[PDB]
Design a protein around this nucleic acid. Sequence first.
RNA 1: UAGCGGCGAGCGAACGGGGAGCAGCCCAGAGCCUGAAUCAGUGUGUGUGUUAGUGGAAGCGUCUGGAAAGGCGCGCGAUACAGGGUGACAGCCCCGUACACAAAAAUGCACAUGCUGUGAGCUCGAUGAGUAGGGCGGGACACGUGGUAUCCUGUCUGAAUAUGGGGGGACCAUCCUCCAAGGCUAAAUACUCCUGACUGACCGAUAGUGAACCAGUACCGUGAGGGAAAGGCGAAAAGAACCCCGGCGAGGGGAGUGAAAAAGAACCUGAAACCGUGUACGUACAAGCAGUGGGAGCACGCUUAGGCGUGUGACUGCGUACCUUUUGUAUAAUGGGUCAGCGACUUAUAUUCUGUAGCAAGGUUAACCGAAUAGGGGAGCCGAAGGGAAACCGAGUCUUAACU
Lengths: 143, 17, 201, 117, 64
Amino acid sequence: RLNTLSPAEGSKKAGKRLGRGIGSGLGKTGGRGHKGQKSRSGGGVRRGFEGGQMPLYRRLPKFGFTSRKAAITAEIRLSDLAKVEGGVVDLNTLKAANIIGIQIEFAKVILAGEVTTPVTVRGLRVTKGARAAIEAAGGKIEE
Amino acid sequence: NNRPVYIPRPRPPHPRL
Amino acid sequence: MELVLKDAQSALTVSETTFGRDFNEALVHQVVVAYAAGARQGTRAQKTRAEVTGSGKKPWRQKGTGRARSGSIKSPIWRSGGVTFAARPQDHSQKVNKKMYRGALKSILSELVRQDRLIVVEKFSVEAPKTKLLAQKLKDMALEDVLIITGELDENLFLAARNLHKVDVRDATGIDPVSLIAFDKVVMTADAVKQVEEMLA
Amino acid sequence: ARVKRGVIARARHKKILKQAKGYYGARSRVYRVAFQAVIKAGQYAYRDRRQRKRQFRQLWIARINAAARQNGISYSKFINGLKKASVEIDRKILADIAVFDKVAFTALVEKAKAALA
Amino acid sequence: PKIKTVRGAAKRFKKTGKGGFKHKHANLRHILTKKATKRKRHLRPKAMVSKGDLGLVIACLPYA
RNA sequence: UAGCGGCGAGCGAACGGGGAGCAGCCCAGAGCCUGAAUCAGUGUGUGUGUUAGUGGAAGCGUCUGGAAAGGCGCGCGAUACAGGGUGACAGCCCCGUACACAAAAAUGCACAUGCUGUGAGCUCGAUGAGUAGGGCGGGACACGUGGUAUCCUGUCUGAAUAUGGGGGGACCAUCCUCCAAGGCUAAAUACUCCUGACUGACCGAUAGUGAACCAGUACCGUGAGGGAAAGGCGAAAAGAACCCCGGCGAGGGGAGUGAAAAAGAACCUGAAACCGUGUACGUACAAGCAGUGGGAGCACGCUUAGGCGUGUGACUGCGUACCUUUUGUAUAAUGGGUCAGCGACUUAUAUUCUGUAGCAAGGUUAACCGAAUAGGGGAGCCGAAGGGAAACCGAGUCUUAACU
């Protein structure tokens, strides 16, 4: 039967071959037009070039700054809050569940819904609705 | 079969300016 | 589902998901193609105009000569040196997802059962390492091109089938889609069957 | 996987040269010239498939005009009479009748004259 | 090799939820005495990148 | 990514995590005890490997044929149908192959046992100065002197020494960590001039190394240097005794060899351009891209006795090559003497979109381990939450004292 397997229709396209006859369609420059910079081998303009006009990424002013504290913080969903370990959640033991990462040292709990098992969170922050969600489930908040 | 070597200037030095 | 025997007539219980699922044509073909591509080694190469032995001196002056402009003796449009896009040693192996590999294997096994190309029997062994004995054992079973899959690999069976081209001996762990498809008949021992579900899951 | 194009190229050239058989000089011997000759013959054949229809139409009209005048009526008058008499014979049959059957044509011109008058 | 982000672009455009880009207006740096408060006020908030030049921005920062 | 950058083009980390592999010591010094472990060099003995090798299974009869290994029929070996050769395609004709053995002599590796040389263990002390640092000028760190830490150095200076000193990115204080200015150290890592075996969706004589043929040769250049072309008789030379024409030629015709001599060494197949001989038809009063449409006659064959086919083609309507580049070319614009061979959108890694396949609020592993295209490995990446320059807030957020 090894000579009977076939792929699904539309899985293959056979690619485009340039400069192979007239009837093949894109022959005689293979769809890159007549003379010009773009028609040359290796030709073209780099990213952001506008033909000499000041590029958009140069006409506009740079703004803001990067905060290092943002790279060491993460957000915790309610859906994944209850599948860490039993019913206790803290800054530690989330890395064991692999939902924040080793380097993260700050975390927050946001309202993502689908929380049923009552859980206790220590050392984390529950914004506004996470507090309500767990309390209905039967959890508690303490710092 | 083999390229020549002397390769003299075949063009005549007479500019029609 | 239920797998019948032809020698002991003993019932066997096996999950229908791994032996009674539908046959996925597209999925199986991709795995088979991937397996063939992984068998390549791609040990080839040519020399570009930079790797061809020679010198960079211009064959003749740019102007005055009556023939076409030339830059080097190694240009691809010149005899004895060239190859515009020379090949390089490359790896043709392609990635196949674990689940996709398992799914194709499950699909293949189910269809072998459907086409009755898979025969389950009790322990399959040969008393002595003799190809003659193995040939006799397969002759009375009306089997000529068979893939013997056993739970435990024994040198006695391995040596007996070594000189038989149409016969292959394999372990459950070392099972590949191409071998199952290629071989006309597949014979699996009771032990060999059990390990398949455990690894397939 | 190197591919040699000797066999395929020779087949294509033979096919063109076979179609160029009978041409004069290099047009039947040399492929570069034979290909141009074959292509031009293709254009002419397409064009003349349409000129043939009009060329024969002109020939039939000339034959009918000669036959009708020999009977004492112009071609334009003769055709008008047939239309008035509700005769659907086309030029090809009319020219054929004039060449072979003179009596049949004499009846036609007589019929045309009656319709006009 | 992996594509290199245009660092200059990354300092002027920030990606948003629906794939757009926000940038600071480009006329509020100096020469501000002669400008009306209305024009300066309207240039303060960030604005979205236009459609025409969106394609250019995508190429400049393919990762961000 | 953070950063650096005429903040342009571009350059581009670290911390931390997962793997491969892991090994720690000595001097700046005295005493007690002194082969006390570990090392290097020379003898002996065991094992293994290299340098010669040995044995190595099993088929015959008919048909075609120059010759069978082929077809047909019936057998046997296989821990050996991996390969090569043999008059066409051999598991059973030969060399080999799996397998089991082999070393007088020389050798690398891992051990045990002797000799030589430095050398264990404990107490106390010591613990690297023109150095660290600084001024000036440069260089290296992703970091271009910038607010610029850290390292190196040409030049000029110059400490403390453990109650001391260095670092933690200007700098200061507090804390944490380490101890420079003396050295040694296999493993995982990089490459193949060379040797053996094995493999290839690598090439098959204009390809593949420049070189399949005594090629880096012939040849070119004062020189450094550059640098070709050229493979194929047949199974076996059985390579044509002898005769004849010819100049005791060349070349040829016979004869013979062979399955084949239009396989005769100028040798397998033997295409095209190009050059010839023969046959049919046309052509010496007719003007041009040489064809096309119509078309008589003639010469060959076919059934029927009329045409059908093949070749030629008087006469006649229409008709100024191809490519390229151009608003536009028969153009007197470009390119091509012709034939054959070769000759131009590829490859690697990333990113986006489309199709398709798997799984699905989940998806997927990389290196690596792995008797290994399996299975492990979830480090990590993408997605489900966004807003803000940021802190921060969060299905909201920012803006504002606050929003109709």
